[PDB]
């Protein structure tokens, strides 16, 4: 699809069989989801945003569908204001910026 | 242009004379630049994201050039870790996400 930016680029994703809403975010290196449960072990990661740094849980090789496109990669879990799909998964679905 | 997302989408902008580097950020409602002086009156605003909130100064009707595309809109100035071009100006240059 082609997504314009007059409104927030919010799309439906699916993870662990559950639908969630997430922001397609080209300003994010990584994908960060709100508190939820994921399989397997996690390791620590510190990430920085507009207001400073937070600690998040890093889960690797996680299955996630974004607008019907399948991706498998790293998903961070923590106190983000909104679920965000970062460049690590945007590249997997073939997403580009165009003007 | 078409910009892939293997790396951060950094571009050159021109504002208030100054040439600056900035990140094309589809997850940002607003454009936020590092501390600088801009012409006109301003009012304070709080903006939030990962890490919480920061206080910024809001300037309206500011002219910017992004990759040589002229765009006018609100520009926020404050202690952002990186210069961000948000949706309010991305729309003006006809920027879209495509996959």
């Amino acid at each position: 699809p082609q997504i314009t930016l007059w409104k927030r680029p919010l799309v439906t994703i699916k993870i662990g069989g559950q639908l969630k809403e997430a922001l397609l975010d080209t300003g994010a290196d990584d994908t960060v989801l709100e508190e939820m449960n994921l399989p397997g072990r996690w390791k620590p990661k510190m990430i920085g945003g507009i207001g400073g740094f937070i600690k998040v849980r890093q889960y690797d090789q996680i299955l996630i569908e974004i607008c019907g496109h399948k991706a498998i990669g790293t998903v961070l879990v923590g106190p983000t204001p909104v679920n965000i799909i970062g460049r690590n998964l945007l590249t997997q679905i073939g997403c580009t910026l165009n003007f | 242009p078409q910009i892939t997302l293997w790396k951060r989408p950094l571009v050159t902008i021109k504002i208030g004379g100054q040439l600056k580097e900035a990140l094309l950020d589809t997850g940002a409602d607003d454009t936020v630049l590092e501390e600088m002086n801009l012409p006109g009156r301003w009012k304070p605003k709080m903006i939030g994201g990962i890490g919480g909130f920061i206080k910024v100064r809001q300037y309206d009707q500011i002219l910017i050039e992004i990759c040589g595309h002229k765009a006018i809109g609100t520009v926020l100035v404050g202690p952002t870790p990186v210069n961000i071009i948000g949706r309010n100006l991305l729309t003006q240059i006809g920027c879209t996400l495509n996959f």
């Binding site: 922001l23 994010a28 960060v32 990430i47 920085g48 945003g49 | 607003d30 994201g49 990962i50 961000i84």
Partner: peptide, 6 residues
């Protein structure tokens, strides 16, 4: 304003 960096 959801810029995020490692």
């Amino acid at each position: 304003n959801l810029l995020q960096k490692k």
